[PDB]
Write a protein that binds this ligand. Structure first.
Ligand SMILES: COc1ccc2oc(C(=O)c3ccc(Cl)cc3)cc2c1
Length: 271
């Protein structure tokens, strides 16, 4: 729909940018208000840093994935500078939150709860025929009520035929990315399942970098030998075995996100 018909379009006037939360190569993230009373996050595009088409493609994709477990698109302003306005998550990113004093006092019981909420969001994405491609604790946001939601849908893609193949030159974070995607550019929901395994390590270690004290070439090499990430300190063995399922050699052997959800809920009502 054109801007004058789009229900997500709002006049820039409805928005007040209050607190700058981040700034990068491609623009800024703010805490702001919509119509005076409603707290929102506002992401702004720095002109010329990147295509306005590429920027807005994130919003158009969030028009197709609306669920409680996923950061919701609130609105767009499609005139320069371009704004994407989303659901505000008061506790910021999972990776930062688990390091704060509140984050530090969480029981293993609440961590497993939070892991099940994330699996539940990814079960929606899986069922809708999408992939995320960037699933990691930096991209799970936490609310004021300590509930979690999937965020940052910049790399998210609809799958018609099973695979999305990346370009020959494209680079992805070696520690969070499934081998087949790093190696062949091929992504599937089963690649996100591999990422979820890594994300489980970050939950149980309060946001520590995966594969403690290894470089990327060491990680790739260990994996090819059949090794997997060393048992993180104070990791229940049940959860460690759930991570191993996510890291099965063959994509098709890795579990569904709905299986991961149900196992995690069992782990949690048992603690
Ligand atoms: C300064 O730390 C914080 C605290 C709270 C915070 O909330 C957010 C968000 O809600 C958010 C929402 C959507 C995007 Cl695309 C990026 C960030 C970012 C953020 C950063």
């Amino acid at each position: 729909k054109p801007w004058w018909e789009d229900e997500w379009e709002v006049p820039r006037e409805t928005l007040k940018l209050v607190e700058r939360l981040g700034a990068g190569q491609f623009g800024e993230v703010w805490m702001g208000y919509y119509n005076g009373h409603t707290k929102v996050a506002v992401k702004s595009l720095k002109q010329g840093s990147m295509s306005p088409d590429a920027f807005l493609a994130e919003a158009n994709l969030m028009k197709q994935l609306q669920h409680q477990r996923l950061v919701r698109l609130y609105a767009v302003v499609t005139q320069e500078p371009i704004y994407i306005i989303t659901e505000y998550m008061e506790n910021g990113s999972l990776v930062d939150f688990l390091k704060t004093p509140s984050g530090i006092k969480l029981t293993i019981n609440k961590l497993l709860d939070m892991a099940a909420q994330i699996a539940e969001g990814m079960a929606f994405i899986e069922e809708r025929n999408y992939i995320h491609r960037d699933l990691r604790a930096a991209n799970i946001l936490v609310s004021d009520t300590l509930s979690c939601k999937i965020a940052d849908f910049g790399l998210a893609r609809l799958i018609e035929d099973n695979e999305y193949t990346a370009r020959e030159g494209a680079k992805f974070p070696i520690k969070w990315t499934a081998p087949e995607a790093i190696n062949y550019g091929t992504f599937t929901i089963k690649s996100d399942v591999w990422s979820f395994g890594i994300l489980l390590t970050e939950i149980v270690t309060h946001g520590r970098i995966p594969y403690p004290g290894m470089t990327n070439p060491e990680v790739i090499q260990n994996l090819e030998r059949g090794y997997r990430m060393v048992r993180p300190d104070n990791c229940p063995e049940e959860l460690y075995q759930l991570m191993r399922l996510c890291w099965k050699e063959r994509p098709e052997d890795r579990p569904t996100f709905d299986y991961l959800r149900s196992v995690l809920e069992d782990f949690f009502t048992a603690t």
